[PDB]
Design a binder for this molecule. Sequence first.
Ligand code: N2V
Lengths: 195, 126, 57, 281, 338
Amino acid sequence: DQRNEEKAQREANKKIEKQLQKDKQVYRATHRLLLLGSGIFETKFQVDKVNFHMFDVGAQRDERRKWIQCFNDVTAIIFVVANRLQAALKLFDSIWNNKWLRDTSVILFLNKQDIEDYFPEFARYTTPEDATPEPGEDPRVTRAKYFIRDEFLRISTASGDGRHYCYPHFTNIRRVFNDCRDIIQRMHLRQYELL
Amino acid sequence: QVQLQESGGGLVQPGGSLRLSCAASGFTFSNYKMNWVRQAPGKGLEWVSDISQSGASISYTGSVKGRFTISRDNAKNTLYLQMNSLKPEDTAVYYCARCPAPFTRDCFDVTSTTYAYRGQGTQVTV
Amino acid sequence: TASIAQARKLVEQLKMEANIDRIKVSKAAADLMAYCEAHAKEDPLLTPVPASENPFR
Amino acid sequence: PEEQLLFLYIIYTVGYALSFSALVIASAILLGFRHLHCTRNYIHLNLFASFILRALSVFIKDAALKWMYSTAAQQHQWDGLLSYQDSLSCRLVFLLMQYCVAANYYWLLVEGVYLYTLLAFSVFSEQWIFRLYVSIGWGVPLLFVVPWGIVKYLYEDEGCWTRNSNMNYWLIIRLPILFAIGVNFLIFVRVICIVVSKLKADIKCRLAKSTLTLIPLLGTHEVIFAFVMDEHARGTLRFIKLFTELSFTSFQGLMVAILYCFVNNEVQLEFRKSWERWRLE
Amino acid sequence: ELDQLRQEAEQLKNQIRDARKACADATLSQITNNIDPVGRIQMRTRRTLRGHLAKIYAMHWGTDSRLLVSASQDGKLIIWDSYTTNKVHAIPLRSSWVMTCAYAPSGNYVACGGLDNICSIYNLKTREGNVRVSRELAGHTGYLSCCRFLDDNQIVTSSGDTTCALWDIETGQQTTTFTGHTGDVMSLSLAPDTRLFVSGACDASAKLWDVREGMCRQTFTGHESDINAICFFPNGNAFATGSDDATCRLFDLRADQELMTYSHDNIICGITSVSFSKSGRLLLAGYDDFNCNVWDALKADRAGVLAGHDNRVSCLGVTDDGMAVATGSWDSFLKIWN
Ligand SMILES: CC[C@@H](c1ccccc1)N1Cc2cc3c(cc2C[C@H]1C(=O)N[C@@H](Cc1ccc(-c2ccnc(C)c2C)cc1)C(=O)O)OC[C@H](c1ccc(OCc2ccc(Cl)c(Cl)c2)cc1)O3
């Protein structure tokens, strides 16, 4: 009549916020990652008892200016870079410069080996001696994967200041765990204004 | 209505020149980053060039750099592409695609699916 | 050959978009001006509602 | 002598005046704005509320000294002061005062171990870990002040304010306090090695900000002034040995208010966006 | 070649264009210049519902104007009580990526969909207490961008594969597909009779569909960028959009042209949500600079700002009695304004 609908309404409300507190302790404990190169492919994995979530988009179109805004809350955008490499620079240039993806860090993985055609500046390019490989695969391969690394770092070190960071790697689940640790740590130093 | 009628094109000798215009309609030309996008016969769409909303930031793909130049005239609402020293690898259908939103630096406009703010194209052969 | 088939379905649409008959703007704008003034006495975001009957006070 | 040591007492009194003034403006900014209700501004608010009651202790003792000068000099009555000294007034006020200085060294500690568990551990539930930090901060000081007042009423209660040379009972206030200074340095040299690891990815002009920011928040200047300001480890031919270590402890509530409320950018945009909500009106 | 009918589509486009120029005898601003204005709309946030963990992409009111559902990207579908600030239900979703939500006009169901390409119907009024999924409506390619119930059995859903679809919940299959958009359909809005609905898409175009015939009736191209939001006038004879070119536009079903543009020089951020008031005199547009400018829908001038949000306003809804505006945003708070 006057409490039979009301103080029992605030009882079913407080049985909700007890489950919303367990759902908050598990939401802040998981790390959401977007992995891009039904309509979503959620992939759970755990490295050293820290649970990660990786979402590969499946049945979606190649128009992505509208669903990429869903993934600004994620920890790190994993960007796997397999002509088709210039299209990966222009995609990474869009992720880096999007107004909503300005606070979202990009882990960046690289695959291919074997160009001077699609990049004529590559022929006038020698590898930095300050960054070397250990096992020594080829002198001619490490001058190429350090070129396309510095193509994707020409985007990241162009007016993208200390709010999102690019982590380029050569190819793996341990490397995402060590980069998501650096993303969370650099966020906690920006909250105390130490970075 | 966003309409983009790109002109120019045709056949050319290897080493020749062209001047592809692109008359823009239905939007303020000054607010948008504009691109040039081509599609080779048997290939997908690759991005060629780019120019910022003032003409300041200008980009090219690696295979056209030095030979091609891009230009816009915000007073006459026309986007240009001068294609000097042409090659047999440069024959494609050249589209005048613009970025979807004004005042932005991110563009998503080389899509096999229907991107809305590009033109029907002009054919360039050698 | 969907290049000619999609542009066929694009041009039957502009045919059925054509054969409709449009009224003038001055007649249609006077019917949106008349809906607002005939319902302005029941717009609680327009008229400042007194605080006893506003249920969110 | 007096021309300089009065200039130190004025700094200690006025340094706690500008601190405690700035620790209410910083505790009304961080508590008034609902958007600034993090689980770290709660640690700041309970630390600013600990620098305040430390500053109220200074006001009390200073006020008492002023009362002795102006009133007890020429009126020539000491019954009130004598009755208060040997009464359960003096002991109670002293214990509360010594809690007000020991709940400061433990709220610069759970402000330090909270930042370390953001950067190192990061696997926890923030529902219960906050209710721990308001229990290590306010309740763990009660475990070595009340056993210190229990032993005070039982042994050596001949005067509430004074003591003797006996320091086998002063292992209850000084030793749990200097443990908390000995941990806020180990967190200081672990957060600093993290920050230089984030800069191994012009840092000499950049580490000079993130080190001087971390010094008032953790209370690291007690360790710095105990190692480089020795100077025979006595009072010898100096003025600025004792001057800095009473200026960098009085103005510390001012510096945790400036560096962690006012020049904070996510607080400054709570004034740069709640003003255009009033500029339209 | 295809130019035997390509230029037929432009020469049809010319004769539609001046057929609207033969119909624009005046403008809406010339008709409504002597209309004395609204004044200064000053809405205070009465409520602030605080229970979501991530960005709220959509809310929807109930027809009783008291309950509302709101979807967030944490995987929640919290049904609120706006009068009491009590969460009635809090539905956990199988997909965290949920970009839309709807409430049944009867009040028995809620729908939600997102990047799992699936609309999920939840029976609130079951005999078990626990709210469970009534149906999954999986026939859409691409993300689901909007959904609006027709009754307890029919729901129209727009999606990311550039098509809208009319469903049948008891069968699960879609009765009608609405094709014609070239960019992905971002929002829809039903007519008050629910025999028509408009749909804005990322081709800077808004189409008017017959629900039972299944065809497109009229197409409205007046914007410049991706239309994120659409809303009918309360009369049902006009509608208002909002796109990424920072302009709202009042279109018109009968004159087949835009009547008015709602612009400002200080506004260079896209509209994410539009709604009308109960009479249609106000047009409340949610923006990306985090506030919600109230527009006089007849005079085109701004009558107020709903500035209380800390991140991007993603949704906006006016009640069915016109007494509240519930705007959610990307900070996880819905605010009821008045
Ligand atoms: C830096 C020196 C300065 C100071 C100033 C700012 C902050 C801190 C420290 N300081 C001042 C001081 C004041 C004293 C004192 C010494 C010094 C020296 C000295 C000091 O550094 N001192 C040690 C050591 C120390 C520690 C604690 C106390 C203490 C304990 C309990 N209560 C009080 C008020 C005090 C001051 C005293 C000395 C310490 O700082 O720790 O001797 C007792 C006397 C008193 C008088 C009257 C009284 O009754 C009140 C009353 C009386 C009649 C009426 Cl009618 C009414 Cl209404 C009210 C009570 C005390 O005030």
